[PDB]
């Protein structure tokens, strides 16, 4: 007879307030694709328009979800991720999709295929406001491999809601997105009702069509390094030892390598009292720029903090350190660690070591298109596609904006 704690729709906004850098939210979605339970080898991040709404999409070729798993994804605190074959999940908290999605936009939808079933999940602030829901309710529709519904009572109600309040008015509209996952397995996340300032999106898509950017009005709370304002630059350094390929705006992201990025590389070790094991550090002088230097702190192969100054905050420059600390704990937005005693010690050690180091030491990739078999029109393709079907038609186009034979061909780049 004991009551369950309840979730109010308003909390959805509240849970997003930790992200003050939007890329933190983006990073979270990427992480979920990266994690070994999904095991995606590609993630495509795109900007498109659907039903007159600017949309951000995250599409991956990973394992997908059962319906129940979908529910957990749309629920708070459920995570069951284990290391596989030395692939360690970043995911811990069980909050990352909600916090990220909602930070990016009011409304989000998840289409997933696990190769036995496909499901569609709705997490909308807008929907909840309209129906004046007192609880967070997440519609789910599920289908067999044959496009036949299952779990009908849930599905019927869910579909009715989704069709009515969703971007996608028709069943036909929904399955198109399911179709945009080319493989048997995978997931597509669509987010709309993006944060707008000055009646325009927080993001700037105009300046570089191959990037998602933060407008000039840019630096973090903290001359800004690129990763601060370019998603592409950020994605490059996001993973220390990349296991997945990220495509932004259809152009794949070229990962940096320490070699060819740094000179006078030297190794160092951290042997805290509190730790069983040693932790390596790599110190380098920064080739590309100068102004960008500091420590790169990675946790579980993912980047938490970058360009953090240590030791000498002038004096000591162009110096970079790379360390991975799996013993620290990330904060709510995974952009910092908990400010513990151990964290403090690590920072201290890093500075001393860096100081020692200092004293001691002194063409984008080609686009690809396919021709439609029933227009003869050429339609643009994103990188990272291993296989095309024998014949390709505008109808099966993943890009929402050229799914019609009657859609004029895009000019190639001037």
């Amino acid at each position: 007879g004991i009551r369950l704690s309840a979730l109010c729709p308003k909390f959805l906004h509240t849970n997003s307030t930790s992200h003050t850098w939007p890329f933190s939210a983006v990073a979270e979605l990427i992480d979920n694709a990266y994690d070994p339970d999904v095991n995606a080898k590609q993630i495509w991040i795109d900007k498109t328009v659907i039903s007159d709404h600017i949309c951000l999409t995250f599409t991956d070729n990973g394992n997908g979800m059962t319906a129940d798993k979908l529910h957990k994804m749309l629920s708070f605190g459920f995570s069951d991720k284990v290391t596989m074959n030395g692939h360690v999940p970043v995911g811990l908290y069980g909050n990352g999709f909600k916090s990220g999605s909602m930070r990016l936009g009011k409304d989000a939808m998840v289409f997933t295929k696990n190769g036995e079933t496909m499901s569609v999940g709705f997490l909308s602030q807008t929907y909840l406001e309209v129906i004046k829901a007192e609880h967070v309710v997440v519609p789910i529709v599920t289908f067999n491999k044959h496009r036949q519904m299952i779990n009908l009572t849930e599905s019927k109600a869910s579909l009715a809601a989704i069709l009515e309040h969703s971007l996608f008015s028709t069943e036909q509209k929904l399955l198109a997105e399911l179709n945009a996952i080319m493989g048997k397995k995978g997931t597509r996340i669509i987010i709309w009702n993006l944060r707008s300032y000055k009646n325009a999106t927080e993001f700037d898509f105009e300046k570089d069509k191959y990037d998602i950017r933060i407008p000039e009005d840019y630096k973090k709370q903290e001359i800004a390094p690129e990763s601060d304002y370019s998603l592409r630059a950020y994605c490059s350094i996001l993973y220390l030892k990349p296991r997945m390929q990220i495509i932004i705006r259809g152009q794949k992201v070229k990962t940096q390598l320490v070699s060819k990025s740094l000179a006078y590389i030297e190794r160092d070790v951290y042997r805290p009292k509190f730790l069983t094991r040693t932790v390596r550090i790599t110190f380098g002088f920064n080739c590309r720029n100068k102004d960008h230097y500091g420590i790169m702190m990675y946790h579980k192969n993912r980047l938490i903090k970058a360009y953090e100054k240590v030791g000498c905050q002038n004096m000591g420059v162009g110096v970079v350190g790379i360390i991975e600390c799996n013993f620290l704990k990330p904060t709510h937005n995974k952009q910092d660690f908990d400010y513990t005693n151990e964290y403090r010690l690590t920072i201290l050690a890093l500075g001393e070591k860096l100081n020692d180091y200092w004293n001691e030491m002194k063409k984008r990739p080609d686009q690809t298109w396919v021709q439609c078999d029933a227009c003869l029109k050429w339609r643009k393709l994103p990188d990272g596609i291993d296989q095309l079907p024998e014949k390709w038609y505008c109808s099966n186009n993943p890009d929402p904006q050229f799914r019609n034979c009657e859609v004029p061909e895009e000019p190639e780049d001037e």
Binding site: Q251, Q367, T368, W378, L381, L388, K391, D413
Partner: peptide
Amino acid sequence: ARTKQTARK
């Protein structure tokens, strides 16, 4: 199917 290639930018 048929696939062109192109320069970017």
